[PDB]
Symmetry: C2
Subunit: 306 residues, 2 copies
């Protein structure tokens, strides 16, 4: 029983974190096999950031311009390329701790674990979601650049995020592990701001199913609804429209609770229209949208509470 924001065990990833220094800037890198991946802005000075030309800045550097430390040991750099907004440093040593891994570009609404690091030392781990506006609502301080996000499937680490920057609203922006940004953001100092966000409807519904599997059905009602009718309500409350695809996804959860997806949607619209009346769901006072349907099945009993 119970339900919590659960992160994946971070061990396989801790073994990959290193420190990367170039001139006066130090940040975190990811050491897999004989390559270290980090944000390219490690080669910038404060004023560089105002309008960097990374191609121009990088040609001016050599292999010995970079200092990579793994714990107490310095790794020798013997090559370097820029891949999009990332640097790849070839090093003279293969990481003995390299887990089986892939690089995946995550979709909005999906969740992942973040291992926050400073100076190449893991400091904490937490779960978060890729917002519709392509930001994540993280917890990062200075020096966290290079921290990564990942999921774990069997023994395989799927790396999906590397942290680059914080936006004026205190939310965070970064790239996948090929250095392509999530969202319309760039790695330089500008007036860029998060676009307006929206609530992840599929996740909220998943979470309501979670509440039921865990023996709670107070918010339910006798009504059902049309996709179209639900979506008129969604618009008004800044929720993403529900699509037939999302209804299909909620299949398995619908079956194990015996609650038709569109009936759940009827409950959801009632909650949005009537508020929660000072009550809680899964201990929360407002609707939660950072659990996917996958997260729910991961963590919940395969047997519902009644």
């Amino acid at each position: 029983s119970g339900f919590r924001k659960m992160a994946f065990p971070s061990g396989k990833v801790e073994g990959c974190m290193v420190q990367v220094t170039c001139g006066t800037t130090t940040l975190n890198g990811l050491w897999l096999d004989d390559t270290v991946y980090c944000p390219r802005h490690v080669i910038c000075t404060a004023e560089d950031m105002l309008n960097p030309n990374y191609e121009d800045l990088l040609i001016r550097k050599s292999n010995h311009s970079f200092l990579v430390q793994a714990g107490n040991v310095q790794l020798r750099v013997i090559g370097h390329s820029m891949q999009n907004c990332l640097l790849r440093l070839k090093v003279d040593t293969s990481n003995p701790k390299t887990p089986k891994y892939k690089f995946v570009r995550i979709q909005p609404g999906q969740t992942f674990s973040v291992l926050a690091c400073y100076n190449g030392s893991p400091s904490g781990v937490y779960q978060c979601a890729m917002r519709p506006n392509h930001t994540i609502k993280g917890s990062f301080l200075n020096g966290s650049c290079g921290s990564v996000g990942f999921n774990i499937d069997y023994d395989c680490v799927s790396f999906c995020y590397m942290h680059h920057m914080e936006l004026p609203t205190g939310v965070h922006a970064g790239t996948d592990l090929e250095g392509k940004f999530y969202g319309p953001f760039v790695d330089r100092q500008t007036a860029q701001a998060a676009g307006t966000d929206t609530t992840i409807t599929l996740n909220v519904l998943a979470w309501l199913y979670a509440a039921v599997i865990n023996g709670d059905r107070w918010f339910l009602n006798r009504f059902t609804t049309t996709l179209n009718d639900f979506n008129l309500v969604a618009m008004k409350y800044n929720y993403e429209p529900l699509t037939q695809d999302h209804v299909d996804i909620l299949g398995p959860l619908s079956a194990q609770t015996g609650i038709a997806v569109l009936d759940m949607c009827a409950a959801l619209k009632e909650l949005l229209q009537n508020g929660m009346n000072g009550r809680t769901i899964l201990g929360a006072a407002a609707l939660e949208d950072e659990f996917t349907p996958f997260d729910v099945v991961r963590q919940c009993s395969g047997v519902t509470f009644q």
Copy 2:
């Protein structure tokens, strides 16, 4: 910026988890040096649990009664004792991955990371608090017994919890690493239930300070209050009384925000009396009590947002 329920990196602990089987029951154990620690109810049958005599049940077993697996490797048991509600199995191999560690008995209101495990394989990590009623609000399914709770200080793992059981309300109960239960609970099947709980006032206040450090002060007011006056309000709302000790603890946070502790208390009572008026704090719709003051300084900037 940002603020999240942050768990400690779980790597040092993952390296210690094993599987312990006795007869038909399998659960998790903790392998440090040449000892494996697990819940003693691993030696019970379903009906045994109704009224076990652990002394009587254990004398009937031998070293070869236990099967310990670490990944694919079976560890040979060569001794066994009961320490309170725990079993200690001496094994023929010292765990090469044993971190520097201590066993500490945590106090109510304090927080820790939980590594949820099944069949000796870590499945997820999350943060939680020891409730005043000595339970934790965890997320555990069948087979999670033996999962542990810990904090990390420098390189030293402080183990503070081992999971034994779930209570009728779906909250969880377990022991410290000497096998002494937190709370008035016992490891057998009975009508035991969680006592009534209360909100952790010191943590709520810490969290309000966190909101300020992060640039939010909407809930503040021009008033101050007496310890006594605050506590009359606390009683009515099922919050723990505030004590001079708690005011001292909130010192450092009070200094860096420039907000007198008792002024913060005035804000708190206003919030409790007036509700949040459909607004949020740190993104939450109700007051949060699972962050200690220590957690706040850990994760927040040492420089407040303005």
